[PDB]
């Protein structure tokens, strides 16, 4: 099917490089480290998303005046005025930021929140990109063993 579609468009011939893995068993020793666990990975993606959703709803309920990713000033955007938008912002920026979510948001200098947002950001860091990527990395390291 892919080889035939390669004539209608000359880019489906890139899918034929998967034959070096699914046809020749020269990469099984390596790929058997990711495909051995299986279910565990889907449970991990099904748990990380729940924890990120909890952090998102907490931010929506207590951190309105922070999600202000304005450019050039007085252009409010990428705010928390929508649950789905805030959830997407979290899942797209806070996970891949490498330093939690506190490095992509405003400085938590506001009163009555100076400590609550510190707990929020540092707990997000310690619970999302520290002990939920460690689970994936241990699911990949244990499979080799």
């Amino acid at each position: 099917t892919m080889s035939v579609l390669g004539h209608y468009n000359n880019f489906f011939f890139a899918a034929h490089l998967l034959d070096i893995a699914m046809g020749f068993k020269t990469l099984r020793t390596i790929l058997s480290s990711v495909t051995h666990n299986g279910k565990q990975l889907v449970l991990t993606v099904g748990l990380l998303a729940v924890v990120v959703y909890l952090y998102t709803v907490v931010a929506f309920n207590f951190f309105r005046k922070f999600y202000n990713k304005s450019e050039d000033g007085d252009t409010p955007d990428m705010k928390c005025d929508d649950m789905l938008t805030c959830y997407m912002f979290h899942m797209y920026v806070g996970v891949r930021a490498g330093g939690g979510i506190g490095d992509e948001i405003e400085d938590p200098a506001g009163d009555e929140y100076e400590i609550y947002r510190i707990i929020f950001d540092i707990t997000f860091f310690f619970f999302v990109i520290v002990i939920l990527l460690a689970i994936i990395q241990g699911l990949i390291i244990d499979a080799f063993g």
């Binding site: 009163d111 009555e112 100076e114 400590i115 609550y116």
Partner: peptide, 20 residues
Amino acid sequence: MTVKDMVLAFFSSYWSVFVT
């Protein structure tokens, strides 16, 4: 007003240990 009073309120409970 929570950036400074938290540590003071946390240590104000250990006065019962300082007295003993």
